[model samples]
Structures are given as structure tokens and as C-alpha cells.
Target: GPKFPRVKNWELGSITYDTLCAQSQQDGPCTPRRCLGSLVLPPPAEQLLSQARDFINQYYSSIKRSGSQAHEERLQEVEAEVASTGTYHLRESELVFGAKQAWRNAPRCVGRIQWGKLQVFDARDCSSAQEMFTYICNHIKYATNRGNLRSAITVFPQRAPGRGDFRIWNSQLVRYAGYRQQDGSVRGDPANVEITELCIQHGWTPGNGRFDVLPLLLQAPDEAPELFVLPPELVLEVPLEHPTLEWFAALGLRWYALPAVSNMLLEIGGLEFSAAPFSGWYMSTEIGTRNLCDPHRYNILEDVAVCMDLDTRTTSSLWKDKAAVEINLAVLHSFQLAKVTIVDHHAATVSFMKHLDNEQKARGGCPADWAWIVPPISGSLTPVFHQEMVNYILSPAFRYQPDPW
Candidate 1:
């Protein structure tokens, strides 16, 4: 049996692991919202048209202009445009509003408290993939901010009828390569094996060790994808070390300071910006458990356990658990010591519950994906596992786009 099951992408909303732990009911106020807007007009673009009108009307109402001519004119424009062209582009104000809404409505994210404060960069007029790379580098520098991190996103142009869409091949701005060894084993991030191989085939020079940062693959319409290596100074990395242990730093463990996901498409109004790269500060569990302790990742649990002098004889000894706690603590401590902004799973989960409560009054209901909302290390121990959540597609949405091979 596997120590921890890696949930597939399709099982996000259908399966709940509360049974693996003890099933606990949500204690505070919670209500279920049904899937209504998903299939409102029974067509892909029609749904967005309806959602756009709703957003426009709501925006007007919030500013005490429920029946203003600006609201009426915008609503009429959306209707007329959808009637003719099947979709309408969001205005600048609408784009900014929708981007923030998309972040708040991100089902997998637990850090919704900072959603409204996101620094959105509009880059819809970018003409080439090389220009796209420059925009990405700028976003990295601005978001990294030396040590003080800021949540940000750079949105490129949307997909059109006769043209190809723009996309970033890399999952995140910063990631280590996974080189398959001749000994039938792997090195570096095993989860990134497919991507690393793709980069190698695309003319990237492979490094000898575990922590080589992969270059960016930028693709645009009717153009061969161009590859650009990120300047090392722009990418901030933290060397992992323990406070009291002397030998820990010698293990050569390190991670990037930013967690910017680059491949997701940002759909606002009825348009899809296929090259919106967004980022946020890491929640400690992301580095501690998923990045380091997971079997497919670094798999350093056993190594750390041995260093801690914990019994490695059996699972009943709980050595993995002890080592995981220390690893998590080390990640939090090291990031704080380096002045990098990071949040723990406990605090992040707590903030998520508060976000749910706030959304209940503000937007009637909040849609959440249970599998992701629950912490990876401690499933039921967090408050998110107990709450029943409804998941559905909402426009002004950030969705995973298929990998461009």
C-alpha cells in the first residue's frame, strides 16, 4: 500500500479523504450551493455571456448605481456582441475586477485573503514569444522583491478564431530538472520528469546535479517556441538548513523562493487569456511535505529520519511522522530567517475558512475543491476537511490548460 495516495486531477471534487481520517462535521455556519451557472445557456460561450452580465450588474450595484446608463449600456453591449460574435471582451475595469474574482474563486487555493490585493499586470498587446519572456522576467523580479514577496499575475492576449494562443510550457517559473539515471532510478524532482525531458529535447543543456533550474518555453501563434534562460539573480532561492543540526546544511537541499504557476489560462468575461502567469507566497507544507517528503519528489523523509537518529526499522516507530514535523518546522524557520514571506498550513487553512465565511455573505456561496483545500500532511487535522464544499466552474476562472508538446 502507498503511504500517501496521490489524488488524480479528475478526482478533485468527487472524492473526499475524510473517511481515511475520522469524518467530522463542520462546526460553524455552513451551507451548500448547487451548480446552476455551469450550464445556464447550455453552450460554452453562452455561460460566460450570462456570467459577464451578472458581474457587470453587480459592479454597478456595489457603487450605488443599479440602474445607471453605464450599466445598461454595458449589459446591452454584451448581449449584442454575444448575439453576433458569440463572445465579448471584458473592459479594463472588468478585466481587473474579474482577475481578482478569479483568484478569490480559485477552488484549490487556501490563500484567498490576499485575493483582492493582487497586483494585476495587463499585457494583452504583446506581439511575440520573445516579448512574452521579457514580461515574465519582469513579473518574476517585481513579485520576488528581493525577499518580501508580493502576489502578482501577468496576463497576455486571449485566444482568437484564426490565430494560435500564447502559452508557457513550464508549470511554474522556477522548477528543478529530473534526470533519469542509467541505474533505473531518478534524480531531482521526479514529478517533473516529463517536463525536464521536454526541455532537454528542446536544446536546454542538462546539468549534472539535482537542482538545475529549467528555462522558460514561450510559444506564440505560427511561431516556433523560443527558450530563454532566467537570470539566476532574478530567481531567489533559499538553502534548507535546520536550526540546531550542523550536518543538515551539507545535504545540498534548496528550493526557489517563488511559487509562480505559469500554465493556467485566465478566463474573464467570455475571453480566455491562455498565458496568465500568477504567483503567491508558498504555504510551508508545499515545500515540506509535497516537495521534499512525497515519494515522487525529493523523498528525503528517510534521509532526514536517519540524520535525526530516529528508528528506521518499522512504520510503527512513527519515524516518518517525527521527521516530517521537523522538516516542516525547518522550512518555516529557514524561510522566516531568510526574510521570505511564507505561511504555514495551519494558518493558511484557518484563513481559508474565514474566506469561506466572508464569501457566504458577500457572494451568497463559495465553491471549494475539498481535495486541495485539505492540507497534504495533516488531512483531517485541519478545519477545512470537516466543511462540506460544492465545486463548479465559474467564469473569471483560472483553469489548467493542457501541456503544449
Candidate 2:
């Protein structure tokens, strides 16, 4: 459970939260920032990604464009180049940036982490994937949610970033995402955006600090955690999850997005909680299907990780009002879906969608109930937040708010 350097300049540039895409050039894309740790993926695909990185790095994006317009062309080119390594570092970086921002702004926003857990591993080993994933799952399966800590996973994602045009499409294809523009600004296209990787941006800290340093190491036994070639783990309990965020939200945790600490990649540890009475349910983030590039594997994460707000956990934990805990457990446990609840807009949306879907089924082929249906974004995150959110929507509408869907 050693720490990886916070910044290592890759041929492409340092891939971390602090590394800024402040400028650009012509050729591929390179940032004058620090880099995270490195990993050697499987061949063919690995070699391709390497070559693509060379291609992307060849040209440094000019740091001049005022809008993302200039970025669009570059991103499109990178999107095409991403086919090689298969891990779109550019898009991945954006996701990381957004996640960090979201956590800084609202730590309570946790999400489901189905594929994020898998992304951090070497792409070639299935057993390694299962072991790492299961370790996290079991942790939450038994971990209690008495405190206020939110749990989630941090994924090393790869993807092709683009959407040249978002104005079209009946059921939109994205969310909180869009194309980079010419003026060096990002286009906030709500539709056609797909998320490829996911991470648990713990918000418990607020405005800038990491609420918990967490004892860096997954507490699972040796065989269980490091069964394969993967490293150990880290962890933080609850209470930290709730109070930290509440403090920051009410006050302010004014630290930089990337803590003063160097290595951003977390290794060997568990998570901490900010408040007590914290709900263990996680919401979902969409990785539009086209971005995922696989059918059966597109929605893989929902069955894997759990999230509090948008952060992920390695276990099957559920959060609920003390009163509803038993009832929700009885219902979900009967079918096998762990019961969880959280506070976030993503969670809210997922809930609405589920309610709509159930009503349709219960009414016996009830179509026409949802024509717009919140404008589909096409990510493999369906069962992810929607199902969990659905339960919350049905949970008597807290604060007298109407149920979702």
C-alpha cells in the first residue's frame, strides 16, 4: 500500500486533478501538468493507446481559445485517436475534473459505481477484477452506516470524447457533458454526453480539503484483497462523511481541488464519514452507451459498486431513514438489491424514472405515460441510479415533495 507519485509528466502530460489544460498547441494534445502513476495494459490495445498518446501529445493544445470551440476539433481528433489505447485520457481527465468539482460543491451527491472499480485494474485479468470488486462489496455488505460517511469508488476510465453536434437526437445522448468549443470553452450540451469512467468524489470535505486522509489500505485479509497483482486498499468510516460536508457546506473547506498532497491516486485504505445519520445509498452517473462501446457490458457497474451521493463503495450497503430501514431492507433483500438512500439530484432523477417504469409495467403495457421520459442520454447507467432512486421516490416523498416520476 505505497503511494504513487502525485505527478509524473507523461509524454502526454501529468494526468491528475491539479494538472491544468491551461494551454494547447497543434498536433495532438498535451498538458503542462503533473502525471499520475502508470500501468502497462494488455498488448495490441495497449500498444494502440501508447501510439495514440504519442499522437495526442505531439501537439499541445493552444491555451488561447476563449470558448471550447477550438477544443472541439482537437477533441474530435483525440476521440478518433482514442481507439488505440481504448482509455480516452482526455475525456477521463474531464470526468475527473467534474467529479472533483461536484464533490467540492456538494459532497452529499454520491452515485453508483458499476464499472469504475474495474477501470482501475489491468484490463486483461478477469479474476483480478472480481477480487478487487468483491473486496469492496463485502466491505460495505458488512460495514454499518450509523455514522455520516458516504462511500464510493474511484475508477481509472478510458474513453473517446466527442458529440460534434448535440442539437439533434430525439432522446438526447448525454448529461452534464458536451463538446469543447473553439474559444477554449466547453459546450454545456445536456444531451448526447456519455460518461466512460467514474470515481467517488467524496464531498464530505467541502470547498477544498480532503475530510479524511483514511488509513490507506483495504482492511480485507491478504488473499481477499491482493489476490492478484493489484495493490492493497484504504478506508475511512462514517461520521466523517456527514459532518465534514455539512461543515464545508455551511462554512467552507477552502482547499484546492487537489489537496496539497501529491499522489492523487488513492491506494491502501478505506473511506471516512462526515455526518452521522448518513444514508448509504448511492446515485448514478451516465456513461452514454455509445461511449461505452459495448452492449452486454455497458451496464456492468450497477451490479458492482455502491455510492453515497455520487461517491462509490466496494460493498453492498444501503442507507435509509431509521424508520424505513427495516422496511426497505425487507423489500430489497427479498429480491437481493441492497437498499440505500442519498441526497442528490442524480438520485432524484433516477427515482423518477423508476417510478415511471414501474407504473407502466404495473398498468399492463402502459405506454404514452412518458413520451419525453427526461430525454434519454443513452448511458449504461440505467439500473445504476434509477432503480435506487426509484425506491426513494416511492418512499413517501420526504419534505412533502412529490414522488419522482
Candidate 3:
């Protein structure tokens, strides 16, 4: 209701006014009727000139060159290009800066503390699906790093007025095929059924196994999608095994090392990159709690609970909670054993608290979504749960785009 929101930490009784939100020129879904802050996507854009100018100004400000001669010249150059062509391009260094800034501005990410450390790969020169597949292969190989994962993003060519967008069909660069069984059940990751079906219809020989790694469906502008199978060696996978539970390893559950999101659009300085895929190391709870335990996902809790000899006949025994904890532990242990990069909920959230403070000093406030910032398993146990957050859109941003199909 005030000019800026007053943020508070319920546990520590701390308070801070989010002045940075005042800079958010875009309006979120919340209004006089109600607040839709908890919804995942709050759905942007301009005459293009103002957004372009604002992003250029942000870039210059980052280098402490605001209002300098070069800054003015760059602004004029962008205006000149957009005035004639209806779109503009970002320089190499500017693209790199904007990519990292988009990660920094992400509201749902707990790992934004490593925002500045991301390695950006420019693939704007690519013009074919085959080339896109090669670039993606390189991204997977580099980001996986033989188990020691690194944060990286591969940016494809920007969208033009008269051209179809370059797009990756899969949500993530690496995901298992979801085969719909004859009995109306799913054989693999249930979340990927649509894409897997699309792949099958497009001439991919679907695999029957539950953990079959889905091939990449890459599309260049104005062309039908092409399927490319990733080389097995490039996809580093970790076999889940619990530290204490000897039978855990026998479950044969595994996950890919890299958590690369491949479908989000990267918007920088009014230019839209439709095929920019980004990756960071996994946080343990994401795999263990959400992917493995969600009812619509693998739904392995019952099997795990039965294996652990937990009383699953009733909810009072807390069997689901017990199985979930062990599953999370197995994920962490397996990743650590395989020498993969991962952060547990405690460590990740603690680091995020530090990141919050750093952003407060650096930008007056940090845009954060409370629902997403808190870990799934132990919500109140994490420090982020106690902290009130302001969710708002920021430019140089990564946004969800419609499926190309």
C-alpha cells in the first residue's frame, strides 16, 4: 500500500523497505481484487525503444559508465538500429553481462549467489538444427564437467520479425522419456509425456526403459524440428545410494548430472532469444523431494516407504516424511560419492541469506518469491521461510515462452 513494500523476517524480527521494487516498471498480477503472488507465472512490453534504452542504461551503470560519452553513443546506436529495423542487437560483452544479470534477477532461484560466475556461450552464429544440437552437446559436456558441474548458459540467435523462433522442445536439456502405458499409467517421468509423444511421432525410436534419456528435438527457424540423440558419455549420471540404507542402491534410480533448463526465452535490451538454454548445479531437495516424491512424478514414496518397513497404512506414522528424508539423503550422498556439484537445502538456503544481504546493499532490495525460495521438505527449517519477499519482474530476464508446436 505504501510507496514501497516493507519486508520482514518473522523469526529474527528484522525489517527492510524494498526500494528496488520501485524501479520495476512492469506490473505484477496482484491488484485491488486479490493477490496472485503465489502463482508460478504472473504474466509484458514496450514500444521497444524505452525497454532498449533502459537496458542499455543498466549495462552502462554496471560498468560505472552511466552518462559517459560511450554510453550516450551506444544508446544512440541502439536507437538508430531500432528506428530503422524494428529490433536491435547486443554486443558480445553486453550479451554476457545481460545473461548473468538475468540470472541475478531471477526471483525463484536460490542459487543466485553464483550469478556472476556463470559461463555464457554465444551461439548466435548457428543457423541449423544440426548446429544447435552440436552447441547443446558442447554445453552439456562443459557444464557436466565429468561430474563437477558448472553454471553456464548457451544463447542462440535472437527472434526476428519475419522468422520462426529457434526452439528446444524439451523443458530441460536432459530428461527421461515418459511413455504412456496401455493401462493409462506412465512408464517413465510422467511430466515429459507430451514431448516424448512428439518425439515418437517425429521418427524417434522410443525407448521402453523408465530412465531412457530422451533425445533432443531442436528446431531452427522456419523448419520442422530435428531429433538428435545425445552421446552417452556427455550425459553424466549419478546412481542414487543411501549412506546407511544398504538396499537403496538396488532401486536402480539415477538422474543426470546437469540440470539445464532449455526452453526459457532470454530477453535482453528488448531482444528476445528463444533458444537460450542455461544450467546450474542441482540443489538436492529439487531432485529428492520434488522429482522423486511428487505424486505426479516418479511417485516412489510408497515403494521406498515399504522398503524402509515404515507403517504406511496410516498417515499418523509419518511414513511419507520418513521416506522423503531418506530419499533426499540418498540424492545428496550419491552426488557427493560421484563427485558431482550439489548443495543441500541447509547450505543453499544459508548462502541465499548471505546473497539477500549482498543484494540489499548492492541494489536496495532483492526480488524474491517466498513460495519458491523456501525448500520443499523443511519449509520452516530454512531461513528463507521466515523472511518476507517482494516478487516483481526485472528486465534482462529469462521468461517462459509458448511451446513451438
In order of listing, the candidates' clash counts read: 0, 112, 0
Query: So what's the TM-score on candidate 1?
Result: 0.86
- Against the true structure, what is each candidate's TM-score? 0.86, 0.21, 0.98
Best by lDDT: 3
**Candidate achieving higher TM-score, 2 or 3:** 3
Q: After superposition, how far is residue 311 of candidate 1 from its true place, in Å?
A: 1.8
lDDT of 2 by residue, 1-405 (tens): 223213222333422221111111121121348321121110254544444343333222213343355555664565465455344433334333333322222211222221122122121112233543444333333232322224332332111232111010111111122333467433333121122011012111111112222211111122222111112122211121122223212321111011111112221101111000111332211122221212332231232222224224323343222212222222222222222332333444465444334433432211111212222332233332222111111000001111111
Error of 2 at 192 (Å): 36
Best by TM-score: 3
Error of 1 at 294 (Å): 0.7
**After best superposition, candidate 2 residue 385: deviation in angstroms?**
18
Per-residue lDDT value at 204 in model 3? 94
Candidate 2 has its poorest 10 consecutive residues by lDDT at 390-399
The model with the greater lDDT, 1 or 3, is 3
lDDT of 3: 0.93
Q: lDDT of each prediction vs. the true structure?
A: 0.81, 0.25, 0.93
